[PDB]
Design a protein around this nucleic acid. Structure first.
Ligand SMILES: [Ca+2]
Ligand SMILES: [Ca+2]
Ligand SMILES: [Zn+2]
Lengths: 75, 155, 77, 77
DNA sequence: CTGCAGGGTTTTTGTACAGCCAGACAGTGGAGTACTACCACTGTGTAAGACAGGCCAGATC
DNA sequence: CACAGTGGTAGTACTCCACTGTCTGGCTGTACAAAAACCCTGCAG
DNA sequence: GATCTGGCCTGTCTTA
């Protein structure tokens, strides 16, 4: 399979070039899809014209750091 | 500095023009076919990148030596389309774990029955081996069967 | 023109998501105790970007145009 | 009535108390005893004449529906 | 015009008398307080395309 | 060697219900001076 | 009427 080849031949060279593998994984987007589904069902206008704009705005607001600073509020 | 790494293999092959995905040329980073990668498993060097793929599409399109289709494909090493976007030459973690987990799941299935004694089984015995494997895994490891190998079942 | 799509401009979303981290970039500058007025032009940012598709996204009646079920999302970090 | 999960509500409570609180919302452990009246098996009641084939205990809460199945292997499982 | 220097302007910044309320301190015995860990387990990963073999059907001498 | 959750239970940690005296910090009537910072004017290039 | 070869067909493997 093509993954057995990739993982038995090219792994040392990969971890030497950059220094990491798992830190550049596709997890961030795969898991963000969950947020996309929950924002297209609960937080967007129910119309074909406007709704991509609402999902985009609310998903940009959920992923800010400045608004995540207040979730801890110094414990 | 941009590093495009969050693509799965389907999209890595689409965005770089290579043919996908059960092709003779298995590696996105190396030029070995299926045969030379089943022969020598652990010795290869990364070659593929963006600029050389552009140049190889040029060679496949101008075709300066008047070669036949099947042999020009081997000379250009799988570049049948023009690359559209540059992606760093890296491996994706999650789908790699999933591929290896489905590979061991198939190995275990072969093992339950005797596959290396009787080399030609039917679909009936294949379904029976899979069924007993899933029943045994559920009884002890606490894993219901899966339609498709998701990451958590692979951990 | 069947496809519906929405997107920020690249450089504008870049500068906004970069200025949002100004808190932590200045706190890292103070923690390392580096010079502030000095060494202002030597920064370097490394940015991972990802692309991905998604199946069986249901569609709605609306007013048009007709649209496929599959959706594609391009995002950066 | 706002479909807030318990852990999300505790997050809201901690954030609203840590900043300028002056805490408004109640903690979780006082909510968990607040609804013991709303759920079944709290008020006293009685039928007449006494019901047939039904026990008279008036405090039975969530009961498992299997209703005493003799899970032993040889029967219908 | 610039520069500095006695003093002015008004304004602050604080110490000064002197009486007096508001809340912390100690404590206690324990309560109920409130905040944490532990426990298994979830979701977002989701369809065509490549290749080898067998064979059949129509064109040719 | 994803990762942010999901609600209930047991445990620790603390912060309080009452009795008590004591203590410091900060409020109020003008008087009294030391700093503040421009602005004047005074004497000099 | 025999023969030959291109294309049709089906099963398996790969990532999803
Ligand atoms: Ca996908
Ligand atoms: Ca995909
Ligand atoms: Zn390779």
């Amino acid at each position: 399979t093509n993954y057995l080849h990739k993982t038995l031949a090219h792994v040392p060279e990969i971890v030497e070039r950059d220094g990491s593998i798992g830190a550049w994984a596709s997890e961030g987007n795969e898991s963000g899809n969950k947020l996309f589904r929950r924002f297209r069902k609960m937080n967007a206008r129910q119309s074909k014209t406007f709704e991509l704009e609402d999902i985009l705005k609310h998903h940009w607001l959920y992923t800010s750091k400045y608004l995540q600073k207040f979730m801890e509020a110094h414990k | 500095f941009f590093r495009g790494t969050g693509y799965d293999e389907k999209m890595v092959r689409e965005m770089e023009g290579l043919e996908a995905s059960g092709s003779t040329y298995i590696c996105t980073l190396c030029d070995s076919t299926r045969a030379e990668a089943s022969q020598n498993m652990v010795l290869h060097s990364i070659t593929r990148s963006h600029d050389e793929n552009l140049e190889r599409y040029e060679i496949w399109r101008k075709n300066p030596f008047s070669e036949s289709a099947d042999e020009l494909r081997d000379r250009v090493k799988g570049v049948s389309a023009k690359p559209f976007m540059e992606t760093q030459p890296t491996l994706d973690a999650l789908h790699c774990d999933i591929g290896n987990a489905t590979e061991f799941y198939k190995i275990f299935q072969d093992e339950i029955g005797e596959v290396y004694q009787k080399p030609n089984p039917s679909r009936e015995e294949r379904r029976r081996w899979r069924s007993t494997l899933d029943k045994q895994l559920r009884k002890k490891m606490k894993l219901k069967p899966v339609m498709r190998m998701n990451g958590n079942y692979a951990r | 023109a069947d496809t519906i799509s929405r997107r920020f401009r690249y450089d504008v979303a870049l500068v906004s998501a970069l200025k949002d981290l100004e808190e932590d970039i200045m706190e890292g500058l103070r923690e390392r105790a580096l010079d502030d007025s000095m060494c202002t032009s030597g920064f370097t940012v490394v940015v991972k970007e990802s692309c991905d598709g998604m199946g069986d996204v249901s569609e709605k009646h609306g007013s048009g145009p007709a649209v496929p079920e599959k959706a594609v999302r391009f995002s950066f970090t | 009535n706002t479909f807030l999960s318990c852990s999300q509500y505790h997050k809201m409570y901690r954030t609203v108390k840590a900043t300028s609180g002056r805490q408004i919302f109640q903690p979780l452990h006082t909510l968990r005893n607040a609804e013991k009246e709303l759920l079944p098996g709290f008020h006293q009641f009685e039928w007449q004449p006494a019901l047939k084939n039904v026990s008279t205990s008036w405090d039975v809460g969530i009961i498992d529906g299997l209703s005493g199945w003799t899970v032993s292997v040889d029967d219908v499982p």
